[PDB]
């Protein structure tokens, strides 16, 4: 029977603190049932970049018991102060939609 979604988890879940010019890496992990497909969507503050340049394209999938996993990752290599804000991942599979969020900080100072 399943077209239900369990949850949408982010990683790193907390303390996402970056210095201006540092690799941002978020991992949106969507847990679903076996007979389920997923469609991701990322909201973010910056408007310089495209969706196809930061968010991954490839199919990261896994299956086990009566569940599955879908992974998508937004990656800003070298950020600016305008890139600071609230980042939201939204998983969508037709009969159900679940999302999750986390705030990415950008401090005006160099990187080691």
């Amino acid at each position: 029977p399943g077209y239900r979604i369990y949850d949408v988890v982010l990683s790193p879940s907390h303390g996402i603190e970056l210095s201006v010019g540092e690799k941002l890496v978020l991992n949106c992990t969507a847990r679903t049932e076996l007979n389920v497909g997923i469609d991701f969507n990322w909201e973010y503050p910056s408007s310089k970049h495209q969706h196809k340049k930061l968010v991954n394209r490839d199919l990261k999938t896994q299956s086990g018991s009566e569940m599955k996993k879908f992974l998508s990752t937004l990656t800003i290599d070298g950020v600016t102060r305008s890139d600071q804000g609230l980042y939201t991942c939204a998983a969508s599979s037709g009969l159900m939609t679940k999302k999750n969020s986390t705030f990415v900080r950008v401090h005006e100072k160099p990187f080691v």
Partner: antibody
Amino acid sequence: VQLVQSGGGLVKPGGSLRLSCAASGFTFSSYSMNWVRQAPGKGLEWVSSISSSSSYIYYADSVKGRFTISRDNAKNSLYLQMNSLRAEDTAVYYCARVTDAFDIWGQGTMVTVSS
Amino acid sequence: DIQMTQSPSSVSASIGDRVTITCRASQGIDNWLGWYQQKPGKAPKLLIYDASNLDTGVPSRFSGSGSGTYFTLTISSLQAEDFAVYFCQQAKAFPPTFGGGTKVDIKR
């Protein structure tokens, strides 16, 4: 948070109608949009579903190979091109956002099919 | 697929009464249930989802419970607005089915 529908009305059997549901007040391109109908003095019948970027679609068996659901995220609208109509499709049709359930609903447009 | 049937057909109550409504499924759906309110000449509004989780804006007097195939909705105290039809819903397996509907009306 708001959905506003348009179109509907009279149509003869075999004809064609297109219902449009314009979303407003949220990130339209993130949520799974749906369609649900309700005939005179009847229960709610789910008709169709669609994902954010239109990669996944489901139809209720009754309307399979007839109605075509699609969306335009640039226009923040959901569509339902209804072809090969029947008198049994005479109902009130609602578009609806789906999160964990059907949380938002459009006002609803009555579509009457008769020769 | 799944068949959702409500009980009873219609319930009579005046202002102040504690109303209760039931919804039964043909097969198991754990706790992925919905509850909707519809008034004459309006689109349905979501009251409760996931068995007993009230949507943002719904009064606290509404309350759901139950699991598996058996489910229940309850109104602690009735008010003029509450006179309407109430549907249950299933979101386990496609297609998502609805309940017949129970019209709460004015008792006399």
